[PDB]
Ligand binder design. Structure first.
Ligand SMILES: CC(=O)N1CCc2cc(S(=O)(=O)N3CCN(c4cc(Cl)cc(C(F)(F)F)c4)CC3)ccc21
Ligand SMILES: [Mn+2]
Ligand SMILES: [Mn+2]
Length: 242
């Protein structure tokens, strides 16, 4: 089985999500054929030279899965688009492009984070165009770490002062550009299975859920596609009247 997760938004202020991800990496991920992380693994990223200890804890936990024989892949999200090759080497993950076509047990599946499908939020897509410009990234990464920390903290507070869903035609355009009947993405935080038509045949868009109160993953087997929700920590059972 191949596993897909996204929108974990890991941060030191949310240790329960971190503990759930570590339990997921030590358990379910070890039995998988592969693990794909489709963006927004971290709530924020200002560069691989960030000494945030959470980054090294996550990197060593993913590396343990990679050392256990499970290849791990990463597609950038809107929050952690600055994740680079330094963290990829520390974690053993392979960085993929914003759109990838996979062969999962015979069926061709398109994977992406999903923010590029939300073409109705032109305010966001302008922001995305800027921060994805290579010379803007090189200039930001050259700034000192404490400057980058203060830039990110101010932009988060300013953005805090409602995620737009995908555009239906953008979905059709992507699945026809890649000639696929299956699409998996996250970003929108609306876990669902949508039926549509692409390339003159029925197609399906599978959406991952954010790790808010419980975990979320998509499991693709040769026999089916599964959207699975599970608790973060081990919910130890313990023991009404007639
Ligand atoms: C809609 C959306 O996605 N948002 C909204 C707010 C937000 C903050 C983060 S962040 O905290 O992780 N961080 C990432 C790197 N950022 C950056 C990068 C570059 Cl290349 C140039 C610049 C420059 F503009 F300062 F030059 C700033 C600083 C902020 C991530 C995503 C988002
Ligand atoms: Mn997200
Ligand atoms: Mn996102």
């Amino acid at each position: 089985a191949t596993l897909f997760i996204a929108d974990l938004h890991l941060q030191t202020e949310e240790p329960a999500i971190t503990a759930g991800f570590l339990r997921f990496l030590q358990g379910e991920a070890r039995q998988a054929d592969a693990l794909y992380i489709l963006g927004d693994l971290f709530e924020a990223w200002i560069g691989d030279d960030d000494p945030n200890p959470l980054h090294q804890q996550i990197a060593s936990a993913i590396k343990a899965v990679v050392d256990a024989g499970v290849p791990c892949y990463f597609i950038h999200g809107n929050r952690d688009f600055l994740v680079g090759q330094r963290f990829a080497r520390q974690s053993g993950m392979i960085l993929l492009a914003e759109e990838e076509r996979l062969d999962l047990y015979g069926r061709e599946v398109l994977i992406m984070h999903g923010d590029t499908l939300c073409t109705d939020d032109q305010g966001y897509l302008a922001f995305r165009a800027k921060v994805h410009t290579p010379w803007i990234q090189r200039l930001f990464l050259a700034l000192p770490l404490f400057i980058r920390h203060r830039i990110a903290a101010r932009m988060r507070a300013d953005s805090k002062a409602e995620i737009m869903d995908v555009n239906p035609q953008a979905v059709v355009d992507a699945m026809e550009r890649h000639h696929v009947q299956w699409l998996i993405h996250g970003h929108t935080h609306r876990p669902a299975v949508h039926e549509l038509q692409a390339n003159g045949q029925p197609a399906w868009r599978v959406v991952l859920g954010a790790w808010h109160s419980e975990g979320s993953m998509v499991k693709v087997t040769p026999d089916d596609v599964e959207l699975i929700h599970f608790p973060f920590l081990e919910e130890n059972l313990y023991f009404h009247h007639h």
